Symmetry: C2
Subunit: 237 residues, 2 copies
């Protein structure tokens, strides 16, 4: 069939990569980031490689409850369907059990975790219309001694893993797979001078294309019996 | 030594059970629930079995950020120390991925998860003073198709498991164990007419004493090398 895919936070990085690969495979695209100008540029990049592409740009903050409803309202309007959802929202800033505070925790929780779930709620009832869907969640790693300053994000990642398992079960009947994809390392700040490459088995860091090759597959028709899964493109824990 | 233990939501049920067993072992007790009258009655029950008991009643809502700080301020004042913490706060109301809503999710998150963590923050710096502590977290079961209407509570339980692991690592250096205790079934509403006993391996439902025997042990001196653990008194998953 000729599917429609909504890829969020795709102005660059992992989302941008998933966008191109998904375009590479003749998916109809609806794309999003906060920055209207950065996102436009991607559409131009995609149309350039593929002139006939159906790319839609809906700038906005997917962390915002209302921006969400509006985006989904639009897609339902301009597309009439939705097959694939790519939940891709960054977690909060790094923190420590010592350094953490509770105002921000709630924020972060709301910013990513709730966002993803609401987004699935909307995607799903759209998806349910055609008894088909592919939900891929960009999530990251737990558990282990943040330590990596990822205290709040790790507990969020856990909650998200749990929730997806649940959701996957509730939505399977409807031919909608729900899987989490945890990349490891790509393009995102942080602070020679860099032997983190030493600690990863493959001894290298991820690439958005590698991550995107995976998400593309999960998005495909042949991936119809794969749900409730948790798969890392991390080269090793 | 002569330790001091703070057991929250101990007006009855599991917390009440932990309170008596801990009293049974000559811990100095600080106890809490929302209901001043229900909690008082426990003190009377404890003093009655043990006349010499040091029981302190601090009524209050441990879900409340400010009530929390105040309770800990008091304990630090009237006790000068704290050895054992019993994080015992009920989760939110049951919900479904379908039926759930996001206002309540945030609430629930704040009500239990954040509560426990803040409570540990306060307990710990108190505990750090004597290079000794025992943090037991009353948590429950994930993951599996709520289904049991436990959608939001399951993802919260997951986040809590993750966070404790982390915290356990950060606090071990200070001789403070952090373990989660997941009971299964005890005294708490729900809606013959009841073959849930069929689905549990032991074919029976938990008892607060069983749960309390465990928490008491984790609270003991001999349990000094047991941290970051996850242990069910559920008779079987």
């Amino acid at each position: 069939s000729k599917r429609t895919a909504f890829v969020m936070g795709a102005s660059q990085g992992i989302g941008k990569a998933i966008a191109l690969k998904l375009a590479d495979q003749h998916f109809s695209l609806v794309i999003n980031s906060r920055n209207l100008d950065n996102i436009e540029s991607v559409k131009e990049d995609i149309l350039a490689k593929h002139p006939e592409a159906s790319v839609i740009v809906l700038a906005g903050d997917m962390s915002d409850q209302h921006t969400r409803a509006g985006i989904f309202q639009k897609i339902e309007s301009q597309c009439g369907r939705l097959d694939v959802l790519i939940n891709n929202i960054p977690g909060g800033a790094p923190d420590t059990f010592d350094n953490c505070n509770i105002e921000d925790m709630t924020a972060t929780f709301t910013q990513k975790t709730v966002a993803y779930i609401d987004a699935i709620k909307r995607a799903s009832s759209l998806m349910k219309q055609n008894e088909f869907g592919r939900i891929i969640n960009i999530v990251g790693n737990l558990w282990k001694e943040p330590g990596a300053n990822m205290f709040t994000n790790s507990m969020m990642n856990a909650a998200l893993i749990n929730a997806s398992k649940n959701i996957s079960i509730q939505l399977a009947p409807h031919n909608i797979t729900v899987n989490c994809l945890n990349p490891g390392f790509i393009a995102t700040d942080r602070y020679a001078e860099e032997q983190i490459a030493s600690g990863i088995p493959m001894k290298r860091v991820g690439s958005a294309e590698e991550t995107a090759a995976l998400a593309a597959f999960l998005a495909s028709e042949e991936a119809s019996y794969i749900t409730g899964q948790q798969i890392s493109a991390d080269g090793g824990s």
